[PDB]
Amino acid sequence: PVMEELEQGLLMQPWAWLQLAENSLLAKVFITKQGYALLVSDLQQVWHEQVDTSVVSQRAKELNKRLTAPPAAFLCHLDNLLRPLLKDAAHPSEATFSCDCVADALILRVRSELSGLPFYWNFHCMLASPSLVSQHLIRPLMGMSLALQCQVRELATLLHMKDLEIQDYQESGATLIRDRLKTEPFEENSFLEQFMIEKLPEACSIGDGKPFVMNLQDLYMAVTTQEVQVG
Amino acid sequence: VMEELEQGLLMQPWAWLQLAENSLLAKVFITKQGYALLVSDLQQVWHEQVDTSVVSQRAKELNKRLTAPPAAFLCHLDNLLRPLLKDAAHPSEATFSCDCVADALILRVRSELSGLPFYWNFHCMLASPSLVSQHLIRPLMGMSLALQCQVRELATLLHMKDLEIQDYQESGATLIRDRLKTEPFEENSFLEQFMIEKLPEACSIGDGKPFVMNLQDLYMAVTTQEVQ
């Protein structure tokens, strides 16, 4: 049950932006007293790591070599360090992050000052399985796109209703107090064509993933919750 | 050659394939120099790239007597497959089947040309993470961003229309029909209500048919922009 709980918690968690040394990553970490589950990406490859208590203790002793703490305390400290950075950027949490690409694995090194005290951790994230990356990125993104298309359709029909109201008002025999407020009739085809011609290049620019985690997280979380509830 | 095939595959839309009580999303690009195929089931993605030598050898192995040049075989395969992918429910005899190997997928297509059998097999191996990413993740994120921008623009237009309606009302001239009254538009309330009721049905990915039927043009535009 511990593994299932960790997987569910990771799935429910939203994406966050990590500013490594001269690089950027999209990270999604769920940490509980029994271990943690991390999923990192850079829009080109996705690495995953599910880690339990025994390996946590082994790695902590190997790295720190002088810190004697139980796995639960280590997990709690790691979660406390990581949460402020994921929640918001530019947080002076004193968490230096480094990335190493050796073989197909990824070494994510985190250094912190635990009350002015070195604290080192290393995520050995192997390549994510096709099923995990699929259910975490592809299906949720398709659901988000479908939901946004439905929202666009609802807005278009509401705009058509408002246009009909404006036409009825004009037919009633009334004139606007001003003239700048006049709005030309809304056409779905013309609006879509103009958008595609003009604003599509700017909107489509994902860049380093910051827009995705800035404007497409509430919808992503809702879609993921719906998917997990369904099955 | 290889670059041309990769670009063609990247610049093509997903098509729905129905076969043996199963559904797939397929992107196929054929050319005289070979073909590229990408098949997904929303759980795994398989990619295949075949050149003239491989296509000729496989055609000889399968069709024991279809003595044709590789270019002609590829052209016939394209002419037989593209009509189905472009539009579903086509009057063709292209029967499809899948065999799920431990790691590979055998996609067998059997059809009839001029009333004679025509067999072909795609031995699609699991697509590399880079290919799957570039083909699905980044374009999907671009589509989401574009749709969000469209929603924002529509909300701005709705706000302008609300301002116009308010200005009309302040003049004191009421409507002739009272059934056309629409309440003022509010982004927060509309978004909350939509998420409450229509989100479960809107976000129902299903077997992939709605994705192909709804927003393939946006996917193509996003992919073309990404290529440039």
Short mmCIF file of C-alpha atoms in Angstrom, two decimals:
data_model
loop_
_atom_site.label_atom_id
_atom_site.label_comp_id
_atom_site.label_asym_id
_atom_site.label_seq_id
_atom_site.Cartn_x
_atom_site.Cartn_y
_atom_site.Cartn_z
CA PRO A 1 0.00 0.00 0.00
CA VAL A 2 2.94 2.36 0.58
CA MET A 3 3.94 2.25 -3.09
CA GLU A 4 0.35 2.84 -4.23
CA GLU A 5 -0.01 5.79 -1.85
CA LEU A 6 3.27 7.28 -3.09
CA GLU A 7 2.20 6.88 -6.72
CA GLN A 8 -1.19 8.48 -6.06
CA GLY A 9 0.41 11.38 -4.19
CA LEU A 10 2.90 11.97 -6.98
CA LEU A 11 0.11 11.88 -9.57
CA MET A 12 -2.01 14.37 -7.63
CA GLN A 13 0.92 16.75 -7.16
CA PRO A 14 1.38 19.59 -9.68
CA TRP A 15 4.44 20.47 -11.74
CA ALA A 16 7.00 22.98 -10.48
CA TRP A 17 9.94 24.88 -11.97
CA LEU A 18 13.50 24.24 -10.77
CA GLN A 19 16.31 26.67 -11.61
CA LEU A 20 19.44 24.51 -11.59
CA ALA A 21 22.98 25.73 -12.33
CA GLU A 22 22.63 27.31 -15.79
CA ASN A 23 19.59 25.14 -16.61
CA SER A 24 15.88 24.70 -15.92
CA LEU A 25 13.84 21.61 -15.11
CA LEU A 26 10.22 20.63 -14.49
CA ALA A 27 10.01 18.70 -11.22
CA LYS A 28 7.17 16.88 -9.47
CA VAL A 29 8.01 15.39 -6.06
CA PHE A 30 5.73 13.77 -3.48
CA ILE A 31 7.43 13.08 -0.14
CA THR A 32 5.88 11.13 2.74
CA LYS A 33 7.24 9.59 5.93
CA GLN A 34 7.57 6.23 4.14
CA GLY A 35 9.66 7.54 1.24
CA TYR A 36 9.24 9.71 -1.83
CA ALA A 37 8.52 9.71 -5.55
CA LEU A 38 10.17 12.19 -7.93
CA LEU A 39 9.55 12.86 -11.62
CA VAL A 40 11.79 15.33 -13.46
CA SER A 41 11.80 16.45 -17.07
CA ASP A 42 13.27 19.01 -19.46
CA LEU A 43 10.72 18.70 -22.32
CA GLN A 44 13.08 16.17 -23.98
CA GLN A 45 13.49 13.31 -21.48
CA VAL A 46 11.65 12.25 -18.32
CA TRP A 47 13.30 10.57 -15.33
CA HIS A 48 11.51 8.90 -12.42
CA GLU A 49 12.64 7.70 -9.00
CA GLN A 50 10.58 5.96 -6.31
CA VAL A 51 12.59 5.67 -3.10
CA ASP A 52 11.83 3.89 0.19
CA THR A 53 13.16 4.22 3.73
CA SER A 54 15.98 1.65 3.67
CA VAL A 55 17.65 3.10 0.58
CA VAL A 56 17.07 6.56 2.07
CA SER A 57 19.08 5.62 5.15
CA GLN A 58 21.78 3.97 3.04
CA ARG A 59 22.17 6.98 0.75
CA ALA A 60 22.05 9.47 3.63
CA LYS A 61 24.81 7.64 5.49
CA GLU A 62 26.85 7.33 2.29
CA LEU A 63 26.54 11.04 1.47
CA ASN A 64 26.57 12.89 4.79
CA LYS A 65 28.84 10.28 6.45
CA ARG A 66 28.39 12.10 9.79
CA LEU A 67 24.61 12.59 10.26
CA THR A 68 22.73 10.03 12.38
CA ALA A 69 18.99 10.49 11.86
CA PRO A 70 16.08 8.12 11.17
CA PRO A 71 14.64 7.92 7.65
CA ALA A 72 11.41 9.66 8.69
CA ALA A 73 13.25 12.76 9.91
CA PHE A 74 15.34 12.85 6.74
CA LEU A 75 12.22 12.64 4.58
CA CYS A 76 10.53 15.39 6.59
CA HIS A 77 13.58 17.65 6.29
CA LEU A 78 13.83 17.04 2.54
CA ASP A 79 10.13 17.80 2.08
CA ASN A 80 10.41 20.98 4.16
CA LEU A 81 13.38 22.13 2.10
CA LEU A 82 11.78 21.33 -1.27
CA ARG A 83 8.25 22.64 -0.64
CA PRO A 84 9.01 26.41 -0.50
CA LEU A 85 10.92 26.31 -3.79
CA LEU A 86 8.20 24.38 -5.63
CA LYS A 87 5.41 26.54 -4.20
CA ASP A 88 7.00 29.79 -5.40
CA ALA A 89 10.19 30.95 -7.10
CA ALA A 90 12.89 33.31 -5.81
CA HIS A 91 12.54 31.83 -2.32
CA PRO A 92 15.72 32.41 -0.26
CA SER A 93 15.62 28.83 1.03
CA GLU A 94 19.36 28.24 0.38
CA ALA A 95 18.92 25.14 -1.78
CA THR A 96 21.68 24.76 -4.36
CA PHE A 97 20.66 22.39 -7.17
CA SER A 98 22.97 20.68 -9.66
CA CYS A 99 22.35 18.19 -12.46
CA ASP A 100 24.62 15.49 -13.90
CA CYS A 101 23.83 13.38 -16.97
CA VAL A 102 25.85 10.16 -16.66
CA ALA A 103 24.67 7.18 -18.72
CA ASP A 104 20.87 7.17 -19.09
CA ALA A 105 20.44 8.07 -15.41
CA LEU A 106 20.25 11.59 -13.97
CA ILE A 107 21.95 12.68 -10.74
CA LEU A 108 20.15 15.61 -9.09
CA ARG A 109 22.33 16.96 -6.28
CA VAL A 110 20.71 19.16 -3.61
CA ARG A 111 22.75 21.06 -1.02
CA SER A 112 21.08 22.91 1.85
CA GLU A 113 22.02 24.70 5.07
CA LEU A 114 20.09 22.90 7.81
CA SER A 115 20.34 25.74 10.35
CA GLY A 116 23.65 26.82 8.88
CA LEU A 117 24.69 23.20 8.47
CA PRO A 118 25.50 21.27 5.26
CA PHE A 119 22.83 18.82 4.15
CA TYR A 120 23.42 16.83 0.95
CA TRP A 121 21.04 14.64 -1.05
CA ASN A 122 21.21 12.94 -4.44
CA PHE A 123 18.28 11.81 -6.59
CA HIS A 124 19.34 8.97 -8.91
CA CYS A 125 16.45 9.35 -11.35
CA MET A 126 16.38 6.67 -14.03
CA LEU A 127 14.45 7.09 -17.28
CA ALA A 128 10.72 7.09 -16.62
CA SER A 129 8.74 4.12 -17.86
CA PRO A 130 6.50 4.69 -20.91
CA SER A 131 3.36 4.08 -18.84
CA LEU A 132 4.34 6.54 -16.10
CA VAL A 133 5.38 9.34 -18.45
CA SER A 134 2.29 8.66 -20.56
CA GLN A 135 -0.23 8.86 -17.71
CA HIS A 136 1.61 11.86 -16.23
CA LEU A 137 2.02 14.06 -19.33
CA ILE A 138 0.22 12.84 -22.45
CA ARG A 139 -3.26 11.94 -21.21
CA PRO A 140 -3.50 14.91 -18.78
CA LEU A 141 -2.37 17.28 -21.54
CA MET A 142 -4.95 15.88 -23.97
CA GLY A 143 -7.64 16.28 -21.32
CA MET A 144 -6.52 19.86 -20.71
CA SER A 145 -6.66 20.63 -24.43
CA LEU A 146 -10.15 19.13 -24.73
CA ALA A 147 -11.36 21.08 -21.69
CA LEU A 148 -9.95 24.33 -23.09
CA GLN A 149 -11.63 23.63 -26.44
CA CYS A 150 -14.93 23.11 -24.62
CA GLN A 151 -14.38 26.39 -22.76
CA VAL A 152 -13.73 28.14 -26.09
CA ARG A 153 -16.95 26.70 -27.52
CA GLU A 154 -18.95 27.85 -24.49
CA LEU A 155 -17.45 31.33 -24.73
CA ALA A 156 -18.23 31.45 -28.46
CA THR A 157 -21.88 30.52 -27.95
CA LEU A 158 -22.20 33.03 -25.11
CA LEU A 159 -20.69 35.69 -27.37
CA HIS A 160 -23.20 34.77 -30.08
CA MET A 161 -26.03 35.17 -27.57
CA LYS A 162 -24.69 38.59 -26.58
CA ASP A 163 -24.45 39.54 -30.26
CA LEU A 164 -28.10 38.57 -30.69
CA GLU A 165 -28.97 40.74 -27.69
CA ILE A 166 -27.04 43.64 -29.23
CA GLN A 167 -28.89 43.16 -32.52
CA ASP A 168 -32.24 43.19 -30.71
CA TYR A 169 -31.21 46.35 -28.84
CA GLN A 170 -30.28 48.04 -32.12
CA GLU A 171 -33.56 46.97 -33.73
CA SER A 172 -35.44 48.39 -30.73
CA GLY A 173 -34.54 51.88 -31.99
CA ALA A 174 -31.86 53.06 -29.58
CA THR A 175 -28.42 54.63 -29.99
CA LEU A 176 -25.36 54.40 -27.77
CA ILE A 177 -24.45 57.39 -25.62
CA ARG A 178 -20.87 57.06 -26.90
CA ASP A 179 -19.37 55.56 -30.06
CA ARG A 180 -16.03 54.03 -29.00
CA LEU A 181 -17.89 51.24 -27.19
CA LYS A 182 -19.29 49.91 -30.48
CA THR A 183 -18.05 46.36 -31.11
CA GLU A 184 -18.19 44.71 -34.52
CA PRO A 185 -20.06 41.38 -34.77
CA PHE A 186 -18.16 38.34 -33.53
CA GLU A 187 -17.42 35.58 -36.06
CA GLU A 188 -15.83 32.32 -34.95
CA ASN A 189 -14.11 31.61 -38.27
CA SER A 190 -12.65 35.10 -38.70
CA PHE A 191 -11.52 35.28 -35.08
CA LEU A 192 -9.85 31.86 -35.26
CA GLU A 193 -8.11 32.74 -38.53
CA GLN A 194 -6.83 36.05 -37.15
CA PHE A 195 -5.61 34.37 -33.96
CA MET A 196 -3.79 31.64 -35.88
CA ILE A 197 -2.16 34.15 -38.23
CA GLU A 198 -1.10 36.67 -35.57
CA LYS A 199 -0.86 35.37 -32.00
CA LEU A 200 -0.19 31.66 -32.54
CA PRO A 201 3.64 31.96 -32.69
CA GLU A 202 3.78 33.71 -29.32
CA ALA A 203 1.26 31.46 -27.56
CA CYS A 204 2.81 28.23 -28.87
CA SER A 205 6.23 29.21 -27.47
CA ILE A 206 6.53 26.89 -24.47
CA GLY A 207 10.17 27.87 -24.00
CA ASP A 208 11.55 26.35 -20.80
CA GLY A 209 8.15 25.21 -19.49
CA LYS A 210 7.57 28.22 -17.23
CA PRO A 211 4.27 29.18 -18.95
CA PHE A 212 3.00 25.62 -18.54
CA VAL A 213 3.51 25.69 -14.77
CA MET A 214 2.37 29.32 -14.53
CA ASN A 215 -0.95 29.21 -16.41
CA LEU A 216 -1.84 25.51 -16.84
CA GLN A 217 -1.68 23.96 -13.36
CA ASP A 218 -5.20 24.30 -11.94
CA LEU A 219 -6.62 22.72 -15.09
CA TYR A 220 -3.89 20.07 -15.02
CA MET A 221 -4.66 19.22 -11.40
CA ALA A 222 -8.40 19.05 -12.07
CA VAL A 223 -7.91 16.81 -15.11
CA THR A 224 -5.58 14.51 -13.17
CA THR A 225 -8.09 14.29 -10.32
CA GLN A 226 -10.88 13.44 -12.76
CA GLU A 227 -8.70 10.77 -14.39
CA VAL A 228 -7.75 9.16 -11.07
CA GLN A 229 -11.37 9.23 -9.90
CA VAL A 230 -12.50 7.55 -13.12
CA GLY A 231 -9.76 4.93 -12.81
CA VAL B 1 15.96 10.98 -47.15
CA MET B 2 15.84 10.20 -43.43
CA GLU B 3 15.50 13.89 -42.57
CA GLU B 4 12.73 14.28 -45.15
CA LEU B 5 10.86 11.29 -43.71
CA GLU B 6 11.23 12.62 -40.17
CA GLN B 7 9.97 16.06 -41.18
CA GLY B 8 7.03 14.55 -43.04
CA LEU B 9 6.07 12.40 -40.07
CA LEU B 10 6.37 15.39 -37.73
CA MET B 11 4.21 17.55 -40.03
CA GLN B 12 1.30 15.08 -40.21
CA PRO B 13 -1.87 14.76 -38.10
CA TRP B 14 -2.88 11.80 -35.97
CA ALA B 15 -5.45 9.45 -37.50
CA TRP B 16 -7.81 7.03 -35.76
CA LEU B 17 -7.37 3.33 -36.54
CA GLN B 18 -10.02 0.76 -35.57
CA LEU B 19 -8.93 -2.88 -35.66
CA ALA B 20 -9.89 -6.09 -33.83
CA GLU B 21 -11.96 -4.29 -31.18
CA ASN B 22 -9.04 -1.94 -30.53
CA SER B 23 -8.20 1.69 -31.24
CA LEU B 24 -4.94 3.39 -32.13
CA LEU B 25 -3.60 6.81 -33.14
CA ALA B 26 -1.34 6.52 -36.18
CA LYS B 27 0.87 8.95 -38.10
CA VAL B 28 2.20 7.62 -41.41
CA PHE B 29 4.50 9.30 -43.93
CA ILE B 30 5.34 7.48 -47.17
CA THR B 31 7.88 8.43 -49.83
CA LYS B 32 9.77 6.77 -52.65
CA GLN B 33 12.76 6.44 -50.30
CA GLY B 34 10.85 4.71 -47.49
CA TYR B 35 8.22 5.21 -44.83
CA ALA B 36 7.91 6.33 -41.22
CA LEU B 37 5.15 5.27 -38.83
CA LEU B 38 4.22 6.25 -35.27
CA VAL B 39 1.45 4.33 -33.48
CA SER B 40 0.16 5.12 -29.99
CA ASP B 41 -2.52 3.60 -27.75
CA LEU B 42 -2.44 6.30 -25.01
CA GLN B 43 -0.22 3.91 -22.99
CA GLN B 44 2.80 3.20 -25.22
CA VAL B 45 4.23 4.65 -28.43
CA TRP B 46 5.94 2.59 -31.14
CA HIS B 47 8.00 4.06 -33.98
CA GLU B 48 9.09 2.41 -37.24
CA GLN B 49 11.33 3.70 -40.03
CA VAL B 50 11.83 1.55 -43.13
CA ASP B 51 14.01 2.22 -46.18
CA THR B 52 14.01 0.74 -49.68
CA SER B 53 16.09 -2.32 -48.80
CA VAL B 54 14.04 -3.20 -45.72
CA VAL B 55 10.70 -2.58 -47.44
CA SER B 56 11.69 -4.71 -50.44
CA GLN B 57 12.95 -7.55 -48.23
CA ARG B 58 9.80 -7.53 -46.08
CA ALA B 59 7.54 -7.40 -49.14
CA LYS B 60 9.34 -10.39 -50.65
CA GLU B 61 9.14 -12.27 -47.34
CA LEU B 62 5.40 -11.64 -46.94
CA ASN B 63 4.20 -11.54 -50.56
CA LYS B 64 5.88 -14.60 -52.06
CA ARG B 65 4.97 -13.56 -55.63
CA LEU B 66 4.35 -9.77 -55.55
CA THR B 67 7.30 -9.02 -57.84
CA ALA B 68 7.28 -5.22 -57.87
CA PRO B 69 9.93 -2.54 -57.35
CA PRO B 70 10.14 -1.11 -53.82
CA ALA B 71 9.03 2.33 -55.01
CA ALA B 72 5.87 0.92 -56.59
CA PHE B 73 5.13 -1.10 -53.45
CA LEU B 74 5.51 1.99 -51.26
CA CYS B 75 3.32 4.04 -53.60
CA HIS B 76 0.60 1.38 -53.53
CA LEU B 77 0.79 1.15 -49.74
CA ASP B 78 0.44 4.93 -49.47
CA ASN B 79 -2.48 5.03 -51.90
CA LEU B 80 -4.21 2.27 -49.93
CA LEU B 81 -3.55 3.64 -46.43
CA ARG B 82 -3.84 7.43 -46.78
CA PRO B 83 -7.56 7.38 -47.74
CA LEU B 84 -8.40 5.54 -44.51
CA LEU B 85 -6.27 7.73 -42.23
CA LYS B 86 -7.46 11.00 -43.79
CA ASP B 87 -11.14 10.07 -43.39
CA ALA B 88 -12.60 7.30 -41.25
CA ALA B 89 -15.38 4.96 -42.40
CA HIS B 90 -13.97 4.58 -45.91
CA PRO B 91 -15.18 1.81 -48.28
CA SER B 92 -11.94 -0.18 -48.33
CA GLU B 93 -10.86 -3.74 -47.57
CA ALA B 94 -7.87 -2.69 -45.42
CA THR B 95 -8.25 -5.03 -42.46
CA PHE B 96 -5.85 -4.37 -39.58
CA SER B 97 -4.64 -6.40 -36.61
CA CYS B 98 -2.19 -5.98 -33.73
CA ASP B 99 0.10 -8.52 -32.09
CA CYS B 100 1.66 -7.25 -28.85
CA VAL B 101 5.18 -8.67 -28.64
CA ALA B 102 7.10 -8.43 -25.36
CA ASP B 103 8.65 -5.15 -26.55
CA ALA B 104 7.62 -4.79 -30.20
CA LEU B 105 4.24 -4.48 -31.92
CA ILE B 106 3.34 -6.27 -35.15
CA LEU B 107 0.73 -4.25 -37.05
CA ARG B 108 -0.58 -6.48 -39.85
CA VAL B 109 -2.57 -4.88 -42.68
CA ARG B 110 -4.25 -7.10 -45.28
CA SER B 111 -6.10 -5.52 -48.20
CA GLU B 112 -7.21 -6.26 -51.76
CA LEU B 113 -5.79 -4.44 -54.78
CA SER B 114 -7.56 -5.11 -58.09
CA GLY B 115 -9.15 -8.10 -56.39
CA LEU B 116 -5.85 -9.67 -55.31
CA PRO B 117 -4.36 -10.04 -51.82
CA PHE B 118 -1.88 -7.53 -50.42
CA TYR B 119 -0.20 -8.16 -47.06
CA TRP B 120 2.09 -5.90 -45.06
CA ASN B 121 3.52 -5.86 -41.54
CA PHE B 122 4.91 -3.02 -39.42
CA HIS B 123 7.39 -4.23 -36.79
CA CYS B 124 7.14 -1.12 -34.65
CA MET B 125 9.58 -0.91 -31.75
CA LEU B 126 9.09 1.32 -28.73
CA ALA B 127 9.73 4.93 -29.70
CA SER B 128 12.67 6.69 -28.09
CA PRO B 129 11.88 9.25 -25.36
CA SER B 130 13.05 12.13 -27.55
CA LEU B 131 10.75 11.19 -30.43
CA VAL B 132 7.72 10.68 -28.17
CA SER B 133 8.43 13.96 -26.39
CA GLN B 134 8.85 16.02 -29.57
CA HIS B 135 5.78 14.42 -31.15
CA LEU B 136 3.29 14.54 -28.25
CA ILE B 137 4.38 16.49 -25.17
CA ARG B 138 5.69 19.77 -26.58
CA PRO B 139 2.95 20.11 -29.25
CA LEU B 140 0.31 19.33 -26.62
CA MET B 141 1.70 22.03 -24.31
CA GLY B 142 1.72 24.48 -27.21
CA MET B 143 -1.89 23.61 -27.99
CA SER B 144 -2.86 24.15 -24.35
CA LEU B 145 -1.15 27.55 -24.30
CA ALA B 146 -2.82 28.57 -27.57
CA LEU B 147 -6.24 27.52 -26.27
CA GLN B 148 -5.65 29.46 -23.05
CA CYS B 149 -4.78 32.55 -25.10
CA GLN B 150 -7.94 32.03 -27.17
CA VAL B 151 -9.99 31.81 -23.97
CA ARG B 152 -8.40 35.03 -22.69
CA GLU B 153 -9.18 36.84 -25.95
CA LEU B 154 -12.77 35.59 -25.89
CA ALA B 155 -13.11 36.77 -22.29
CA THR B 156 -11.84 40.22 -23.29
CA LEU B 157 -14.36 40.35 -26.14
CA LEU B 158 -17.13 39.32 -23.74
CA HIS B 159 -16.09 42.10 -21.35
CA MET B 160 -16.23 44.62 -24.19
CA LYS B 161 -19.70 43.37 -25.15
CA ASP B 162 -20.81 43.65 -21.52
CA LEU B 163 -19.58 47.25 -21.45
CA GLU B 164 -21.53 47.97 -24.64
CA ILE B 165 -24.68 46.40 -23.18
CA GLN B 166 -24.29 48.45 -20.00
CA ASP B 167 -23.88 51.63 -22.03
CA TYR B 168 -27.02 50.76 -24.00
CA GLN B 169 -28.93 50.15 -20.77
CA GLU B 170 -27.85 53.45 -19.20
CA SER B 171 -29.68 55.23 -22.04
CA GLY B 172 -32.98 53.92 -20.64
CA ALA B 173 -34.06 52.23 -23.89
CA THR B 174 -35.14 48.70 -22.95
CA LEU B 175 -35.40 45.67 -25.21
CA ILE B 176 -38.47 44.64 -27.18
CA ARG B 177 -37.97 40.96 -26.27
CA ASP B 178 -37.26 40.08 -22.64
CA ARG B 179 -36.10 36.52 -23.41
CA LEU B 180 -32.80 37.70 -24.95
CA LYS B 181 -31.43 39.11 -21.67
CA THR B 182 -28.04 37.56 -20.88
CA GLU B 183 -26.49 38.07 -17.46
CA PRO B 184 -23.15 39.92 -17.29
CA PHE B 185 -20.13 37.72 -17.95
CA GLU B 186 -17.73 37.02 -15.07
CA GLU B 187 -14.55 35.03 -15.65
CA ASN B 188 -14.27 33.58 -12.14
CA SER B 189 -17.87 32.40 -11.83
CA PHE B 190 -17.94 30.98 -15.36
CA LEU B 191 -14.67 29.10 -14.85
CA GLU B 192 -15.78 27.70 -11.49
CA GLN B 193 -19.14 26.58 -12.87
CA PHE B 194 -17.54 24.97 -15.92
CA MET B 195 -15.04 23.09 -13.77
CA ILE B 196 -17.90 21.99 -11.52
CA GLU B 197 -20.25 20.56 -14.16
CA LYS B 198 -18.76 20.23 -17.65
CA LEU B 199 -15.14 19.30 -16.84
CA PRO B 200 -15.68 15.52 -16.38
CA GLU B 201 -17.30 15.21 -19.81
CA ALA B 202 -15.04 17.75 -21.51
CA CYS B 203 -11.80 16.10 -20.33
CA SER B 204 -12.97 12.57 -21.22
CA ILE B 205 -10.07 11.51 -23.44
CA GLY B 206 -11.64 8.13 -24.17
CA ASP B 207 -9.92 6.02 -26.82
CA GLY B 208 -8.47 9.06 -28.62
CA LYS B 209 -11.27 9.65 -31.13
CA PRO B 210 -12.24 13.09 -29.72
CA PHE B 211 -8.61 14.21 -29.86
CA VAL B 212 -8.41 13.41 -33.58
CA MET B 213 -11.88 14.76 -34.36
CA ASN B 214 -11.69 18.04 -32.43
CA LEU B 215 -8.33 19.84 -32.55
CA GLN B 216 -6.08 18.24 -35.16
CA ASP B 217 -5.73 21.53 -37.05
CA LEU B 218 -4.34 23.22 -33.93
CA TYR B 219 -1.93 20.30 -33.46
CA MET B 220 -0.72 20.64 -37.05
CA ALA B 221 -0.27 24.40 -36.70
CA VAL B 222 1.63 24.03 -33.41
CA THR B 223 3.91 21.36 -34.88
CA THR B 224 4.58 23.46 -37.98
CA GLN B 225 5.45 26.46 -35.80
CA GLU B 226 7.75 24.28 -33.68
CA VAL B 227 9.53 23.01 -36.79
CA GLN B 228 10.31 26.57 -37.88
#
